Amino acid sequence: TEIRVHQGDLPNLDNYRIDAVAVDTETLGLQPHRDRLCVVQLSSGDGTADVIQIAKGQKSAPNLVRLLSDRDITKIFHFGRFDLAILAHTFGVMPDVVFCTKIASKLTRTYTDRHGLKEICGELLNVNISKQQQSSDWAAETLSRAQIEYAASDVLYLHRLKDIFEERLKREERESVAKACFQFLPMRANLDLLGWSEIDIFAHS
Amino acid sequence: TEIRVHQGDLPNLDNYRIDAVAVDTETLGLQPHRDRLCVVQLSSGDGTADVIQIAKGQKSAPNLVRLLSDRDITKIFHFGRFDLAILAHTFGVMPDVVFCTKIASKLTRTYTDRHGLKEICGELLNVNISKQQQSSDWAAETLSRAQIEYAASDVLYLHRLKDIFEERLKREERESVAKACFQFLPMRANLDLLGWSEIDIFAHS
Amino acid sequence: MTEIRVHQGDLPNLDNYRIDAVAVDTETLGLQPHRDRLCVVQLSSGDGTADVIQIAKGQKSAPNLVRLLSDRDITKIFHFGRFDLAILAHTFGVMPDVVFCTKIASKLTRTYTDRHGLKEICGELLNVNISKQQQSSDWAAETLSRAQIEYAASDVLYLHRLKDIFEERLKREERESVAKACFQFLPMRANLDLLGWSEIDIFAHS
Amino acid sequence: TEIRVHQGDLPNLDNYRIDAVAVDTETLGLQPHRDRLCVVQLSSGDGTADVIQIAKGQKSAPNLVRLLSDRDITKIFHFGRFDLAILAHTFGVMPDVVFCTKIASKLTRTYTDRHGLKEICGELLNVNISKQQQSSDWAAETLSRAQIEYAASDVLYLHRLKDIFEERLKREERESVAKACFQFLPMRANLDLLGWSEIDIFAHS
Amino acid sequence: TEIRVHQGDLPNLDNYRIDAVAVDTETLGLQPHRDRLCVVQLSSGDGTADVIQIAKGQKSAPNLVRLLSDRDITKIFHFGRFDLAILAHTFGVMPDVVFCTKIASKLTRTYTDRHGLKEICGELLNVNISKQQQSSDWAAETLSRAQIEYAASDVLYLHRLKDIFEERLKREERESVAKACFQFLPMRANLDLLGWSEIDIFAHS
Amino acid sequence: EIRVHQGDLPNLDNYRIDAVAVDTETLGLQPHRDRLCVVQLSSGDGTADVIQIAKGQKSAPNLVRLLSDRDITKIFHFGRFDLAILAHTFGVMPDVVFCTKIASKLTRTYTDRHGLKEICGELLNVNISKQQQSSDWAAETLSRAQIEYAASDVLYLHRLKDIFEERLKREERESVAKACFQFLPMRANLDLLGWSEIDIFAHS
Amino acid sequence: TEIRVHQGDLPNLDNYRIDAVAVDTETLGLQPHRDRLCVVQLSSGDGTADVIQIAKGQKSAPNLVRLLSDRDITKIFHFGRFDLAILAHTFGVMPDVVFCTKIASKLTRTYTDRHGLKEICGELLNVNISKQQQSSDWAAETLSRAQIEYAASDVLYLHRLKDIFEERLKREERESVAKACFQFLPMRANLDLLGWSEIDIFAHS
Amino acid sequence: EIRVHQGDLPNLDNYRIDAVAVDTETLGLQPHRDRLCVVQLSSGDGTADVIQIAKGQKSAPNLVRLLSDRDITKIFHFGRFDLAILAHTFGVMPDVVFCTKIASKLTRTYTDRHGLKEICGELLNVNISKQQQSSDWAAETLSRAQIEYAASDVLYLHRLKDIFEERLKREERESVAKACFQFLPMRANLDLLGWSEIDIFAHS
């Protein structure tokens, strides 16, 4: 399993001249104003991954941000609500062409109440995600092999999941529903950063 | 306050050659698949209102529906999530240019946790909304005077509220946030009709 | 102005109850029929008058009242009859089987509110004010107070008028067969309570 | 264990000239207005099962529906409240002669709080139900071997359970209680379809 | 209404040569190890009361404690579980002949869920208890008239309440039940002092 | 060794003792609905008696003689329940009792787990298997697993009582425990009378 | 009584050559990162108050901030945990000599569970605080008289409350406890700003 | 190596150090009811001292000298409890402390599990077994499992403190932690005084 580990940014975009990129992040926690971005993971879907260690106080990552800014490239996330918030807060660019496998699961896997990435990968791909390293020191100068493998596992399968969810959205005629949810998702992430992270803005109460 | 009561539909659109229309509904309850649309209320903001009784099984209301589908006219609601759902369910047209005073309140009245229409009208306009008729038999062949006046009260003030909320959204620099929420609101209502009425589609769980 | 006839033990006869439907309510020492004895049974023919029958501790028989409860040609009208049916059947050994319940009817028709209590229904449908102050009182007292007697009668004086309106709503929304099935099961729901399932929704998944 | 897989409907009722038939369904989820009927399973109690794939948009299944409508044949379900709702919603016929093993368990297995089919089969029959396929894509064009065997397992044992529950209902003198519950169950299912799925219609609040 | 205010102790027992004495206390709070005894109130049932201010650090009150120790005198409380604990903690003597109107209410007023002294006095005696001074500085050197009248109101009616509750206990044949509860009540208070104040010692969990 | 009986003990030859371990099995937790099915007894000598109670059975004279004997302490685990169903079935409420669950709550202050399985594991290194706790106790013939489970609930209560008595003495809570045990039969009666969901001593 | 309204800052410190100053704030809400400081209120305890309107984006208030950083002047708050957070976030200076009447109430008024400023003023001073304006638009260019009088009422009585609470802390011998709580309070407010506002940092879980 | 003592350390020869790891065992969570049974200490050299405290014991001069020494930082995991029982038993409240649970809540923001077992697993790959946490700590003779568990609670606190200090420096929270540690003894006193169920800083 080829995983390329980088410091600060991708060295170039030679592996990402593609129409969709799988994206994930690791941080010191769930609160972007307190918990810094530590790792950004990328995959083109070819079974390899890039793991980028982000330094404390790092303000720019030009190659990564070019991908995030590129309207011709769909950014694939699992629960992108979080990744979009921490990426936009750290580097100042909010992606606006996105696909989220958790929203897609909630719109299609109506026969289960389990929408986590581990459960999705098990059902749709018979792929086992191990979450032991999800809670680890992601700010460590040197990531362990277990950490690097876990981080890559979050992007290695998102293209395959998106293809299956797209089939399900088409079958149940929910494509326009999903598109509108993905269109609002960057603003849902912005609402979190602005102070509404605990509020369903559409609820009656 | 002039309240014009109609059966089925507006007679014409002479009072609605305007850029924004205040809209509200009354039904037999909170569940559009079970609880039929009984009343639609409209106001141009000039201190008068139209109260339209909708018959059981009524499939058409051409003048009202023309307004709902006119993209040059903003439809103003309080908690439009509901009105949009029952209107789209009954007549087959989902409005797509909307303003919601409840979402606007949640984005601006951060100094309170009370975002109901009565509380908003009291604070912003010193207008007293009486809610006694909210729970009444809206399917009655003849609406009582109290029902008619209550139904009109829900649209008579939405233009004035929208003007104040727009001032607040500009002051706190949240205009683009509100716009994105309003753009998604018709799809939030569609999600309710499709079976996700109890699900925050953007939540982690 | 309201005529309320107070009796000891039983109605003297059924002269006022040669009718197709009778309004029925009870008062007890509490919500648990195995612990809390039946103290009062209230009846109305719908003519604006009521009968209030004091039931003695240990009383086993009330032949005229029980004749009405057993008469399949007379519909017994209750508000939340789930309770009244349980205590009546537990006390006298006869479970009525032709019933109408205004609380079930409200839950099937007043879909625009979440308040289905008798006070709220009477206020909305009839502009009649029910005062609940005596609901929690010593219903086993040898002599009922005037306030207790008036409160007990108020629970049956309006049920015919409520039933008429609810029947209009059930017809309008085409739910008559739904209500009939609920009313047919209601005596068994009360029996389930007496048998030990009072805290269990027998139809729930969990 | 012989499992006969059919498309759309049984070819005939030659295997169902019996007094009681075990019935189960599979769907895309718990909400009949959103989640379509995908599979209907039947067993005569002879250790074999019929698994019928229902097509999207399928409106009729005359042989199956003849069985469901036959008042001389008791339909045995586990938690029939759900199966009755989706069957009636899909084909327009509500069975009215039924036995439910979950209601029967709640009236007899008073020494436990676990009334699921898996737990009942384990205790009463020493039969192991595996539920891994309960949450799976039941709308798949080709059901997997695991899906087919799971679907059959839900009907293969209901006759044997009903026999035991009938013994328990007789021993504890609750036969007329159970009969009244089964008599109301089709209307409980109708109440769900009509909009009362979240309401205990007999509760004080 | 005659209320005699004392410092430290009764001057003598001339008013308490009786079979039953009504007793209440006031403290700085609900936790006897932290919140000192400030007032002890007594009534013979003759419509007068004694209000005894207890000093900080006071170790003895011989006349009061003589009454509390006298096995021929029933001590009447409302929710004596508390008064018994603070009295025993302060003066080292636990009364063992007691009557509690709250336990009596819970065993007889089965037609209500409100067992507070105010509600009991309203129903049984048409007496209005005002609770405004219940939360006040009971350690003040000089109690206000409102405090003194409130403190007296808690003992002025307990004899009359006990008489009525004894009638109800006889009527419903619960006298032996009540007696066993009263016999255990001093140990329930002791359990509170020893560290089980938050534990129902008889509960399964 | 487990002796299985129908209806009652044949005699009291094994129970001329100062304390007897007692347990029951029923069709459920509600004595007015769920009949007494089994009564289990042990003298503490490592053997047990398992008595099947018939539907509608009104008397069990030898068992009831034990329950009535004030010279014999009845040892239970969570006797609040056993006292209720026994008194409801046979009309005699024992009044000299020891409860290992109350004793645990008064002594095992270093844990929040007071079930019999947990107590036996900690104090005796005895493994209680609870699989048969939820089973058809009204069956005409009890299974071997049922009979062994029923006996296991009484085989160890004497040994537990001895340890809890040491702990009650050590922490000086003997009089507290005695008052709780004295009230326990009335706690069971309160349950039968309709207060099963009410802590009668609580403020609310 | 006399309420002096200022724009931006006090004109001078002529009224604040004192040992202790009462301080309160008003904002657009409870979240300092989202909800800006709008008003700062001060009183010397002489029955007069200064109400200072703070502009959006205002970075400096030199006279007010001199008071906040003067170690010889105790800053008196009610629930200073909030005021300290918004003041330190806005002007960059965290006071470190403070007294909080809510903490003081929780350490002394053990006979009640109501520790809000309204309840405290009612009991200790027979002063009626009206809370109607607490939820109002504090960012308004012109505050209403009701707003100004409410804002002043929050500081007019804190000196008198501090005196009484100091008496209670001495009487119950809790002076050193209160001092340690006050010493930690600025760090509790800092912890809120840093991202732990929903965490009791001393709790087991 | 685990040295077991009765009452007190024999001397302070092993504790001429800058920081000492401290833990306790009791009969439960309520210091006014549940007596101190064991005090455990380690210098960080991989050995531990386990001191059995007698019922009614009022003094432990060598232990208390360590607790009083301002030049020696006392390291705890969830010191809020240990500080309360130590101060209540011997009358001395330590005022120079480090708590690994507070440190975890200030640094391990990527998890919601802050127990000692979870910390040791993540930071050290050390497996803490909690089976003996709920045991009779007042036993005259502690079992080997009890002694080893008691020692395991102090054997690793030095290594944990070192790592947490690195994290506190890295995220610039050193002054935050210091203020929390400064208040921690008074948080413990508040528990003893009657506020154990109250967050004194909460709005409600």
Author numbering:
A (entry chain K), B (entry chain C), D (entry chain G), E (entry chain E), G (entry chain I): 2 to 206
C (entry chain A): 1 to 206
F (entry chain M), H (entry chain O): 3 to 206
Text from the published report:
Orn and NrnC are 3′–5′ exonucleases with a DnaQ fold containing the catalytic DEDD motif, a domain that is common in enzymes that act on nucleic acids. Notably, Orn (and its eukaryotic ortholog REXO2) or NrnC activity is critical for cellular growth, rendering them unique amongst the exoribonucleases known to date. The structures confirm an octameric assembly as a conserved feature of NrnC-type RNases.
The diribonucleotide pGG is bound to all eight active sites of the NrnCBh octameric assembly. The active sites face the center of the central cavity formed by the NrnC octamer, positioned mid-way of each ring. The side chain of Y151 coordinates a water molecule, which likely serves as the attacking nucleophile in the reaction. The structure also reveals the molecular basis for substrate coordination. Reminiscent of Orn’s active site, the bases of the diribonucleotide are splayed apart by a leucine residue, or L-wedge (L31). Continuing with the parallels to Orn, the 5′ phosphate of pGG is coordinated by several residues forming a ‘phosphate cap,’ in this case basic residues H79, K103, and H205, the latter being the second to last residue of the protein, contributed from a subunit from the adjacent ring. The specific motifs coordinating the substrate are invariable in NrnC orthologs, in contrast to the exterior surface with overall lower conservation, and culminate in a length-restricted active site that appears optimized for diribonucleotides. A comparison with the structurally related Rrp6 exonuclease subunit of the exosome bound to a longer RNA substrate supports this notion as residues K103 and H205 of NrnC’s phosphate cap directly block the path for longer substrates.
